[PDB]
């Protein structure tokens, strides 16, 4: 059954899409031989989230759900995993991941049409349980990054757009997780309560949507889930892993009106601990990382619904070419792997790095 109560990951199996599988098989494997080539083929089996970073990706969302329907009637029981990520004036704190819609060019109205498009696909496939991460970095940027003019002038649009996303996708087969940054971002004691207030306000302002399950953490980041020793670059923060973050912000969400909020955590680039990060704020194509804890609903945690792979390992975080569009200085740093292609595009060297440093190992 597509509908659910409680943990939406219980009773289903996350779907490994053909989009990532095509990338690995056609862009990575032809370049690899021997033990590496076989290890790479195994990675394409690991379920990860499909990103709807453009409106042109929604037909591919439908294609993926078409594959799930076929698989479910052949005997299986699979669930869809997608990311809603096409906000007007997207990626307001950086320059690497600016999107197609801008507030000045009717972006809010274009975002609502984008949401309407997704809703129709979700109604078309109401027989399939659909798991969604809502707008990465957006709300986390509104907490700490209002000093950036792009974020400040995007606050009203973000909040109206997110509200439209959580109410229009509030369907019986949907489970939503608002992006909530990570331990190195909002995990700091000073950021915890202001972050909790904002998430709870989004929840309350949308009339407590029953499909809105909770928060997603560490999306496209590198933090360890439950590492016992604090890495050098976490110096000053008692919240140095993802487990500590969710158990801190959790009761704070309840304080501000959001009871029964649960968490998912990205671990697809968290295998090697500590990372090659020279500063904790460095996010672009970070060196010294590997594939981490495999997706599983058996977490052994009171608040974690599932380990997930949101960011598909191999897809770039941003270009290191200073003569290219959308260039961010974060991608030219010593701990950023070079040379790096455009954000979202395939980064061959980075995939090889992730596979070699994988823990659990594929080799
Ligand atoms: O300006 C920032 C700052 C931070 C940050 C703040 C505080 C502490 C540490 C870091 C950022 C952190 C993170 Cl995790 C950021 O995520 C990057 O941005 C996007 C997702 O929001 C990712 O790019 C997208 O990847 C998708 C999947 O491959 C593609 O579909 C999409 O085309 C592409 O835009 C990127 O990989 C993350 O690294 C951004 C921060 O920005
Ligand atoms: C509350 O909802 C309205 C839409 O009804 C939206 O425009 C506004 O941004 C929301 N406020 C907050 C604080 O999220
Ligand atoms: C961390 O979590 C993983 C996966 O749930 C588990 O194998 C390991 O025992 C945990 N370690 C600690 C120290 O809690
Ligand atoms: C999905 O949810 C509905 C209730 O909304 C049930 O009727 C069904 O059995 C399943 O649990
Ligand atoms: C999802 O599908 C997998 C493979 O069929 C199962 O192992 C799991 O129990 C769930 O039904
Ligand atoms: C399968 O999909 C990937 C990602 O779009 C492509 O890179 C590949 O060429 C094939 O079409
Ligand atoms: C791409 O195709 C190859 C061979 O068919 C697989 O090994 C891989 O898992 C991916 O699906
Ligand atoms: C990668 O893309 C090629 C087509 O360019 C396919 O032949 C292959 O199966 C994989 O999807
Ligand atoms: C795979 O990687 C090799 C280098 O290792 C390239 O030459 C090839 O074009 C493909 O990207
Ligand atoms: C990994 O193993 C496969 C066999 O499944 C080989 O075909 C490949 O060459 C690599 O050694």
Swiss-Prot record:
Bridged cysteine pairs (disulfide): 92-151, 284-331
GO molecular function, one term: cellulose 1,4-beta-cellobiosidase activity
PTM field: Asn-226 contains mainly a high-mannose-type glycan (Hex(7-9)GlcNAc(2)) in a 3:1 ration with a single GlcNAc. Asn-205 was primarily unglycosylated with a small fraction (18%) bearing a single GlcNAc at this site.
This protein's record includes keyword Repressor: no
Catalytic activity entry: Hydrolysis of (1->4)-beta-D-glucosidic linkages in cellulose and cellotetraose, releasing cellobiose from the non-reducing ends of the chains
This enzyme's EC code(s): 3.2.1.91
Gene Ontology biological-process entries: cellulose catabolic process
Activity sensitivity to pH: Optimum pH is 4-6.
Region span, Catalytic: 1-363
Annotated active site: 137
Keywords: Carbohydrate metabolism, Cellulose degradation, Disulfide bond, Glycoprotein, Glycosidase, Hydrolase, Polysaccharide degradation, Pyrrolidone carboxylic acid, Secreted, Signal
Glycan-carrying positions: 3, 13, 22, 25-26, 31, 38, 205, 226
GO cellular component: extracellular region
Record's subcellular location: Secreted
Site (Transition state stabilizer that also modulates the pKa of Asp-245 and may act as a proton acceptor through a water chain): 91
Domain notes: The enzyme consists of two functional domains, a catalytic core joined to a carbohydrate-binding domain (CBM) by a serine-, threonine-, and proline-rich, highly glycosylated linker sequence.
Function: Exocellobiohydrolases (CBH) that catalyzes the hydrolysis of 1,4-beta-D-glucosidic bonds in cellulose to release the disaccharide cellobiose. The degradation of cellulose involves an interplay between different cellulolytic enzymes. Hydrolysis starts with endoglucanases (EGs), which cut internal beta-1,4-glucosidic bonds in cellulose to reduce the polymerization degree of the substrate and create new chain ends for exocellobiohydrolases (CBHs). The CBHs release the disaccharide cellobiose from the non-reducing end of the cellulose polymer chain.
Family to which this protein belongs: Belongs to the glycosyl hydrolase 6 (cellulase B) family.
Extra information: T.reesei produces two different exocellobiohydrolases. They are unique in that they can hydrolyze crystalline cellulose in the absence of endoglucanases.
Protein name stated in the entry: Exoglucanase 2
Species in which this protein is naturally found: Hypocrea jecorina (Trichoderma reesei)
Source lineage: Eukaryota, Fungi, Dikarya, Ascomycota, Pezizomycotina
Underlying gene: cbh2
């Amino acid at each position: 059954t597509a509908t659910y109560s409680g943990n939406p990951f219980v009773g289903v199996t996350p779907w490994a899409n053909a989009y990532y599988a095509s990338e690995v098989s056609s862009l990575a494997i032809p370049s690899l031989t021997g033990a590496m080539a076989t290890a790479a083929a195994a990675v394409a089996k690991v379920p990860s989230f499909m990103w709807l970073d453009t409106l042109d990706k929604t037909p591919l969302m439908e294609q993926t759900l078409a594959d799930i329907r076929t698989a479910n009637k052949n005997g299986g029981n699979y669930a869809g995993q997608f990311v809603v990520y096409d906000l007007p004036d997207r990626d307001c704190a950086a320059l690497a991941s600016n999107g197609e819609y801008s507030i000045a060019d009717g972006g809010v109205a274009k975002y609502k049409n984008y949401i309407d498009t997704i809703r129709q696909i979700v109604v078309e496939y109401s027989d399939i349980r659909t798991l969604l991460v809502i707008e990465p970095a957006s709300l986390a940027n509104l907490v700490t990054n209002l000093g950036t003019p792009k974020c400040a002038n995007a606050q009203s649009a973000y909040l109206e757009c997110i509200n439209y996303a959580v109410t229009q996708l509030n369907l019986p087969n949907v489970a939503m997780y608002l992006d909530a940054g990570h331990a190195g971002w909002l995990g700091w004691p000073a950021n915890q309560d202001p972050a909790a207030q904002l998430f709870a306000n989004v929840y309350k302002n949308a009339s407590s949507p029953r499909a809105l399950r909770g928060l997603a953490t560490n999306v496209a980041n590198y933090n360890g889930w439950n590492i016992t020793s604090p890495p050098s670059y976490t110096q000053g923060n008692a919240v140095y892993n993802e487990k500590l973050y969710i158990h801190a912000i959790g009761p704070l969400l309840a304080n501000h009106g959001w009871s029964n909020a649960f968490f998912i955590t990205d671990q697809g680039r968290s295998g090697k601990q500590p990372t090659g990060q020279q500063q904790w704020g460095d996010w672009c194509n970070v060196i010294g990382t590997g594939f981490g804890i495999r997706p599983s609903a058996n977490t052994g945690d009171s608040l974690l619904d599932s380990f997930v792979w949101v960011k598909p390992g191999g897809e770039c975080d941003g270009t290191s070419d200073s003569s290219a569009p959308r260039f961010d200085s974060h991608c030219a740093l010593p701990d950023a792997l070079q040379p790096a292609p455009q954000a979202g595009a395939w980064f061959q060297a980075y995939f090889v790095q992730l596979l070699t440093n994988a823990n659990p190992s594929f080799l």
